[PDB]
C-alpha cells in the first residue's frame, strides 16, 4: 500500500480529491488554511500510486505526497484486473 501523506501546506483546493481515480483523498475540516478544509487519505489501501493527486496540487511543492512502496504491493495498488488475491 503506497503511503500517501498530507502536509500543512495544503490549502483546501479539493483538486487532489477530484484527481484520484480510486477515492483515496478526502476533505476534512481543519483550522490551518483559509479554506478551513484539508485533504486526508483515509483509504490509502485503494491508492494505485498514479500520482494524479500530485499533478493537481497547486502549492510550491506537493502538499500531498505519494510514497511508492514496491515491497508492499497489493492487488489494489497493482491495479490487478484478472487476478484476485482476496
Amino acid at each position: 500500500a503506497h503511503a500517501v501523506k498530507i502536509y500543512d501546506t495544503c490549502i483546501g483546493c479539493t483538486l487532489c480529491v477530484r484527481a484520484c481515480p480510486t477515492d483515496v483523498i478526502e476533505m476534512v475540516p481543519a483550522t490551518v488554511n483559509a479554506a478551513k478544509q484539508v485533504a486526508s487519505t483515509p483509504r490509502v489501501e485503494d491508492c494505485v500510486g498514479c500520482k494524479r493527486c500530485e499533478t493537481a496540487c497547486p502549492t510550491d511543492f506537493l502538499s500531498i505526497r505519494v510514497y511508492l512502496q514496491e515491497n508492499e504491493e497489493t492487488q489494489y495498488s497493482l491495479g490487478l484486473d484478472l487476478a484476485d488475491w482476496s
Binding site: 501546506t9 476533505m27 487476478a83
Partner: protein
C-alpha cells in the same frame, strides 16, 4: 458452458486464496474502519439483499442496456466485485469503464466491475452528466458488502463533519526527518511515517552531535572481568561540569529566543 467458462466454481478455482494472502502478503490488510476515517462515523451497513453478488443476478431490471464485452471482470477466476448503484433521470448512453457503450435505465441502475478504479471512473463520468447518489459498493468472496465512495454520504470533494484527518503531517514536506537521522529506528526507510515529535527530536539530535565542544564523551563500559582501571580522568567532575555547561547553554539559548 464448460468451454466458455471453467466448470468449477470460483471458490474451487480460488483454492486457498485466503490463508495464503495472509501469508504471502501479511502487510495487505485494511484498517479497522476501511471506508471511513473515524470509528464514530455512522458506518452505514448494507447486505447481499441490497446489492447481491453478480453471479446471483441474471437479467436484472437494474442492469443498464449493455451488450456484454470481453473486457469485463473474470468470472470464476476472480471473486472480488465492485458495484455501482446510481439513479438516472433519463435513458442516455454512457461509456463503460471497460470500453464499449451501455445505455442507462430510466430509474435505478446497477453495474458490476472488478476494480474500484473502473467504478470511480464511471462515477466521474456520471457526475459530469449531472447525476447524484452514485453509490459504489465492494463485493467480497463470501458476499460481505462494503459501502464505498460516498462513504459518509457526502462526496469527498465536499468537506463534511465527523471526518477525522488521516495521514496528516503537521509540517512541510521537506521538514521530514532524513533517513540518516532516523537510522536504526523503525522509520529508517520510511521517514514520512515518523511522528512530528520523533522528527523534531532527531533533527535536534543531529545538531547536538555537531557541537563536540560541548558533547559528552560518554565513558566506556566496564566489560572486562578485572578490576576497574584507575585511569587519570574523574568522570564525576566531568559530569558535574557538563551539568553546569548544559544549564548555562540552555539558559543562553532560551535568552536568545
Amino acid at each position: 458452458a464448460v468451454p466458455n467458462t471453467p466448470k468449477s466454481s470460483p471458490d474451487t478455482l480460488a483454492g486457498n486464496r485466503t490463508e495464503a494472502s495472509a501469508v504471502s502478503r501479511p502487510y495487505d490488510k485494511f484498517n479497522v474502519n476501511y471506508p471511513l476515517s473515524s470509528p464514530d462515523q455512522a458506518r452505514t451497513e448494507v447486505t447481499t439483499k441490497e446489492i447481491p453478488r453478480p453471479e446471483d443476478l441474471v437479467d436484472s431490471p437494474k442492469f443498464p442496456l449493455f451488450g456484454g464485452s470481453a473486457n469485463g471482470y473474470m468470472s470464476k477466476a476472480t471473486r472480488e466485485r465492485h458495484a455501482i448503484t446510481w439513479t438516472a433521470k433519463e435513458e442516455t448512453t454512457f461509456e463503460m469503464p471497460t470500453s464499449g457503450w451501455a445505455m442507462m435505465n430510466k430509474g435505478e441502475n446497477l453495474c458490476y466491475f472488478r476494480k474500484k478504479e473502473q467504478c470511480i471512473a464511471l462515477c466521474k463520468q456520471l457526475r459530469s452528466m449531472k447525476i447524484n447518489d452514485v453509490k459504489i459498493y465492494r463485493l467480497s468472496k463470501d458476499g460481505t458488502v462494503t459501502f464505498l465512495h460516498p462513504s459518509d454520504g457526502v462526496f469527498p470533494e465536499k468537506v463534511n463533519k465527523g471526518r477525522v484527518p488521516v495521514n496528516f503531517r503537521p509540517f512541510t514536506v521537506c521538514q521530514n526527518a532524513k533517513q540518516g537521522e532516523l537510522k536504526f529506528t523503525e522509520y529508517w526507510t520510511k521517514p514520512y511515517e515518523a511522528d512530528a515529535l520523533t522528527t523534531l527530536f532527531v533533527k535536534a539530535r543531529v545538531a547536538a552531535y555537531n557541537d563536540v565542544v560541548n558533547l559528552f564523551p560518554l565513558p566506556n563500559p566496564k566489560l572486562t572481568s578485572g578490576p576497574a582501571e584507575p585511569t587519570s580522568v574523574d568522570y564525576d567532575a566531568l559530569t558535574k561540569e557538563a551539568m553546569e555547561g548544559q544549564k548555562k547553554r540552555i539558559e543562553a539559548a532560551m535568552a536568545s529566543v
